[PDB]
A paper describes a structure:
Human carbonic anhydrase (CA; EC 4.2.1.1) isoforms II and [name] are implicated in neuronal excitation, seizures, and neuropathic pain (NP). As CAs are implicated in maintaining the bicarbonate gradient that results in the efflux of HCO3– ions through GABAA receptors, this study corroborated the involvement of CA [name] as well as CA II in neuronal excitation and seizures. In this study, by observing the significant similarity in amino acid composition and active site architecture existing between hCA II and hCA [name], a new series of CAIs were designed, which can concomitantly target both isozymes with the aim of achieving a neuropathic pain-relieving action. In detail, CA II and CA [name] share a Phe residue in position 131.
CA [name] is deemed a brain-associated CA isozyme as it is predominantly expressed in the CNS while missing in most other systems. To understand the molecular basis responsible for the inhibition efficiency of phosphonate/phosphonamidate benzenesulfonamides against CA II and CA [name], the crystal structure of these two isoforms was solved in adduct with phenylphosphonic acid 3. This compound based on the ChemAxon software has a pKa value of 1.62 and, therefore, is assumed to bind the enzyme at physiological pH and in crystallization conditions in a deprotonated, nonchiral form. Crystals of the CA adducts with 3 were obtained by soaking experiments as previously reported for other sulfonamide CA inhibitors. Data were collected to resolution values of 1.26 and 1.94 Å for CA II/3 and CA [name]/3 complexes, respectively. The electron density maps were very well defined for both proteins and for the entire inhibitor in the case of CA [name]/3. In detail, in both structures, the benzenesulfonamide moiety binds the active site in the same conformation adopted in other CA/benzenesulfonamide complexes, coordinating the catalytic zinc ion, forming two hydrogen bonds with residue Thr199, and establishing many hydrophobic interactions with residues located on the bottom of the cavity. The phosphonate group points toward the hydrophilic region of the active site13 and forms in both structures several water-mediated hydrogen bonds with enzyme residues. Finally, the phenyl tail is oriented toward the hydrophobic side of the active site13 establishing many hydrophobic interactions with residues delimiting this region and interacting with residue Phe131 as hypothesized in the design. The comparable number and nature of the interactions established by the inhibitor in the two active sites might explain the similarity of the inhibition constants against the two isoforms.
Residue numbers in the entry: 4 to 262
Write the structure that this text describes.
C-alpha cells in the first residue's frame, strides 16, 4: 500500500504508519554548524569481508544486495555504537534528475543518490525483524553519491542491474565487497532516527559519512533504468525513491570532526 508515486508517496505514509509523524523520524537535514563535535566517540570501523554477498534483488522500492549475516565477519563497530552490528543488506535511493535523490541533506543540499548499509544488533536480538523494532536494534551507515568519474568497483553492480530491471527479480551476486563503496574518510555525523521506509520504526542509529563517493553519469543512469513495475505492467521507472527530511524535534546531531 506504499510507494513513491503521487498517490502512495512519503507525504501519505502517515495515513498507514502513524509513527511517520514521530519524534525520531529519518532522514533529516544536517545543519553542519549545528552539529556537536563529540571527541569521546570511538573510531568508526567498517570490517567487511570480500565474499559475504549473496544476491541482488529489485524489491519494488530499491535494488538491494543481501549478505550472509550468520556470523560477525561483516560488521560496523565504534563511533556511537556500543558493540558490533552485522551487515544484512545495502540498497540505494536516487532521483529522476541529477540534483536530487538523497534522503539526508546537508545544509539543505541533496546528492543524486544515497547508499544505505544496514546493520543489526545480532548479539542482542535473534532476528533482523526483532532488532528492527528496538531503539538500539539497527545501525545504518549512509554514504552520499555524487556524479563525476566512473567508479571501477561500481561497474560490477551497475552491470548487474539489467537482469533485475523488473520488480520482484533477483540474481546471484557473489564476492562483492561493500568496502569498495566507502570513501577514504571515516568522518561522520550520527543521530538517533528511524527506518526511512515503512514500518518507519525508530530503531536506527544513523551514521552518515561526511565524504561522498563518486560514480559516473552512465553508472547513475543504470539505476534510473530499473523499474518500479513488474514484467507485465506498463513501465514506470524506479526514480525519486527517497523520503525527504523530517523534523529534528530537538534531537542532537553529533559529528566525529570539526566543521
Ligand atoms: N532505508 S533504511 O532506513 O536504510 C531501511 C528501511 C527499512 C529497513 O527494513 P526492511 O528491509 O524494510 C524490513 C523490516 C522489517 C522486517 C524485515 C525487513 C531497513 C533499512
Ligand atoms: Zn534506505
Amino acid at each position: 500500500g506504499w510507494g513513491y508515486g503521487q498517490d502512495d508517496g512519503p507525504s501519505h505514509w502517515h495515513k498507514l504508519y502513524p509513527i511517520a509523524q514521530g519524534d525520531r523520524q529519518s532522514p533529516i537535514n544536517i545543519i553542519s554548524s549545528q552539529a556537536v563535535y563529540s571527541p569521546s566517540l570511538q573510531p568508526l570501523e567498517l570490517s567487511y569481508e570480500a565474499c559475504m554477498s549473496l544476491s541482488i534483488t529489485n524489491n519494488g522500492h530499491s535494488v538491494q544486495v543481501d549478505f550472509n549475516d550468520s556470523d560477525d565477519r561483516t560488521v560496523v563497530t565504534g563511533g556511537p555504537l556500543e558493540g558490533p552490528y552485522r551487515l544484512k543488506q545495502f540498497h540505494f535511493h536516487w532521483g529522476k534528475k541529477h540534483d536530487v535523490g538523497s534522503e539526508h541533506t546537508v545544509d539543505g543540499k541533496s546528492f543524486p543518490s544515497e547508499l544505505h548499509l544496514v546493520h543489526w544488533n545480532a548479539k542482542k536480538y535473534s532476528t533482523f525483524g526483532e532488532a528492527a523494532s528496538a531503539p538500539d536494534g539497527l545501525a545504518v551507515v549512509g554514504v552520499f553519491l555524487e556524479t563525476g568519474d566512473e567508479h571501477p568497483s561500481m561497474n560490477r553492480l551497475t552491470d548487474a542491474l539489467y537482469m533485475v530491471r523488473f520488480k520482484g527479480t533477483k540474481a546471484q551476486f557473489s564476492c562483492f565487497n561493500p568496502k569498495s563503496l566507502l570513501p577514504a574518510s571515516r568522518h561522520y555525523w550520527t543521530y538517533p532516527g528511524s527506518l526511512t521506509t515503512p514500518p518507519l520504526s525508530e530503531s536506527v542509529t544513523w551514521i552518515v559519512l561526511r565524504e561522498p563517493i563518486s560514480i559516473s553519469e552512465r553508472q547513475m543512469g543504470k539505476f534510473r533504468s530499473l523499474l518500479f513495475t513488474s514484467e507485465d505492467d506498463e513501465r514506470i521507472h524506479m526514480v525519486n525513491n527517497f523520503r525527504p527530511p523530517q523534523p529534528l524535534k530537538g534531537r542532537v546531531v553529533k559529528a566525529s570532526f570539526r566543521a
